[PDB]
Amino acid sequence: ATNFFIQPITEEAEAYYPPSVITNKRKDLGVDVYCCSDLVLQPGLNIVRLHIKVACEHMGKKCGFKIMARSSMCTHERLLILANGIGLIDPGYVGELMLKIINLGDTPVQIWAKECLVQLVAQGDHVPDHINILKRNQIFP
Amino acid sequence: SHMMATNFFIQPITEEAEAYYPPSVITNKRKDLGVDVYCCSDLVLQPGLNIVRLHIKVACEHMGKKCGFKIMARSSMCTHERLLILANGIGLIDPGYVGELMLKIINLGDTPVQIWAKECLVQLVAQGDHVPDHINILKRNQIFPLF
Amino acid sequence: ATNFFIQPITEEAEAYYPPSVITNKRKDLGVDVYCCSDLVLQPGLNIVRLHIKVACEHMGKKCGFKIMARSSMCTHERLLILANGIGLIDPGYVGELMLKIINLGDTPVQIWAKECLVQLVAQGDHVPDHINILKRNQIFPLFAP
Numbered sequence: 001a002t003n004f005f006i007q008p009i010t011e012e013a014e015a016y017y018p019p020s021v022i023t024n025k026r027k028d029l030g031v032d033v034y035c036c037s038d039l040v041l042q043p044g045l046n047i048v049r050l051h052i053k054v055a056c057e058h059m060g061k062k063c064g065f066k067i068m069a070r071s072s073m074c075t076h077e078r079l080l081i082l083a084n085g086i087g088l089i090d091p092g093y094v095g096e097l098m099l100k101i102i103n104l105g106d107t108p109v110q111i112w113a114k115e116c117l118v119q120l121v122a123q124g125d126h127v128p129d130h131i132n133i134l135k136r137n138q139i140f141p
Numbered sequence: 142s143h144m145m146a147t148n149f150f151i152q153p154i155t156e157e158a159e160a161y162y163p164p165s166v167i168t169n170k171r172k173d174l175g176v177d178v179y180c181c182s183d184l185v186l187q188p189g190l191n192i193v194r195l196h197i198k199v200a201c202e203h204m205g206k207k208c209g210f211k212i213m214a215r216s217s218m219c220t221h222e223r224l225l226i227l228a229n230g231i232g233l234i235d236p237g238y239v240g241e242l243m244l245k246i247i248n249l250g251d252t253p254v255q256i257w258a259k260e261c262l263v264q265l266v267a268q269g270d271h272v273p274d275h276i277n278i279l280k281r282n283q284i285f286p287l288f
Numbered sequence: 289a290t291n292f293f294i295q296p297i298t299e300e301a302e303a304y305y306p307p308s309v310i311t312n313k314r315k316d317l318g319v320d321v322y323c324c325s326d327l328v329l330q331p332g333l334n335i336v337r338l339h340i341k342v343a344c345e346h347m348g349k350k351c352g353f354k355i356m357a358r359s360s361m362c363t364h365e366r367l368l369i370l371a372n373g374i375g376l377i378d379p380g381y382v383g384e385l386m387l388k389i390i391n392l393g394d395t396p397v398q399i400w401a402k403e404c405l406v407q408l409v410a411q412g413d414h415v416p417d418h419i420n421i422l423k424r425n426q427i428f429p430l431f432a433p
């Protein structure tokens with residue numbers, strides 16, 4: 001009914017997205033995605049790449065989805081917000097997912113490749129059945 | 142296929158909340174998407190991140206199954222003299238959560254600002270943006286199975 | 289299945305919303321919407337009118353929609369966000385769309401009438417099939433109380 005397809009673009013992303021078919025059994029709404037690189041976020045705006053191409057599918061038809069902050073993105077010591085509130089991904093988009101993150105604080109803050117700052121939410125808030133992680137060399141299903 | 146039922150269940154947790162949530166069934170005949178929700182207590186929010194308890198337990202139900210909901214700011218939250226925004230753009234609550242609902246509010250200004258018990262800074266929106274049919278305001282001292 | 293109806297309220301809106309029917313051939317989720325006049329946004333809160341009445345309809349029934357920033361609204365030289373994150377428009381609202389924009393920088397920033405800072409997204413995120421731009425000088429029952 002509702003499935004995601006994630007393809008790592010970079011060598012760094014490959015370390016975090018080994019090819020795999022995840023069945024979403026706890027029925028999580030959002031698909032957490034990694035930073036894939038350590039980065040230092042300056043006060044103000046930061047362009048943050050997510051190292052992945054993503055396709056979402058609902059009832060067998062390619063559909064859009066939304067990039068949303070995870071609850072832990074903003075903590076007391078890290079005042080980080082998604083510049084656009086919600087990242088709206090149109091079904092026709094086939095490029096790399098990109099983030100704009102504002103560090104509202106006065107000093108830089110460190111993020112680690114292992115962290116998931118944001119989550120992918122299918123158009124319509126449909127809970128995903130499967131999350132397909134494709135090979136870098138692979139071909140989008 | 143054609144028409145589904147969507148309902149919210151709000152249960153007050155504190156004595157302050159009982160003032161704003163008398164046991165009641167609210168019918169949503171205006172077909173508003175969101176469910177306004179009170180602060181219940183006067184609070185001073187410091188610059189930066191503030192964790193605000195909402196004094197309620199919330200369940201959302203769609204087609205008879207417990208579902209998630211979304212916390213969204215109301216227009217009244219941010220005023221010229223009170224630069225307030227929801228921390229995570231939109232709050233995302235999973236159906237399994239049965240704790241007290243909490244806001245993450247960022248005070249963007251340099252000075253402390255006040256929120257007041259009677260204000261609704263935020264509204265609850267069912268997973269998938271379904272218009273609620275009923276808002277059930279449950280008695281405080283009750284055991285309810287959906288929680 | 290899912291249609292937007294946009295009606296310009298002001299003469300400034302008419303500069304950007306000529307009467308026409310737009311097809312959404314790319315199947316984008318959002319409907320880009322213009323500022324309609326040049327504005328100076330001071331540091332802190334700014335109330336910004338959008339000069340339009342909008343109705344959304346899905347499967348023959350009036351529904352809600354959401355105002356969302358476009359990723360181009362915020363750049364290194366203009367630190368702009370929507371105060372409310374997402375603007376929730378109830379299916380019964382038939383007045384002018386209004387925006388609360390926070391300029392997080394320390395200096396006024398200039399936005400131009402032709403820029404589209406936000407987009408409209410149907411309730412439930414349904415892809416729009418048609419975007420109808422209605423004539424200003426007309427009363428339409430979809431916008432009745």
Ligand SMILES: O=c1ccn([C@H]2C[C@H](O)[C@@H](COP(=O)(O)O)O2)c(=O)[nH]1
Binds near residue numbers: 067087089096099
């Ligand atoms: O946070 C975001 C928002 C959008 N996009 C991509 C997918 C969209 O289809 C495309 C154009 O978006 P606007 O510039 O029209 O918002 O950019 C992102 O990668 N990240």
Ligand SMILES: O=c1ccn([C@H]2C[C@H](O)[C@@H](COP(=O)(O)O)O2)c(=O)[nH]1
Binds near residue numbers: 242
């Ligand atoms: O804005 C929010 C986000 C989350 N939660 C609840 C639901 C989650 O299951 C639980 C854990 O969230 P963190 O401790 O990760 O914030 O808190 C809230 O009450 N408000």
Ligand SMILES: O=c1ccn([C@H]2C[C@H](O)[C@@H](COP(=O)(O)O)O2)c(=O)[nH]1
Binds near residue numbers: 375378381385388
């Ligand atoms: O950014 C926004 C949010 C809301 N509204 C309109 C549509 C809503 O139905 C109405 C009341 O919304 P609150 O004041 O309840 O957010 O205001 C806007 O014009 N712009």
Ligand SMILES: [Mg+2]
Binds near residue numbers: 173177
């Ligand atoms: Mg309201």
Ligand SMILES: [Mg+2]
Binds near residue numbers: 316318
């Ligand atoms: Mg677009």
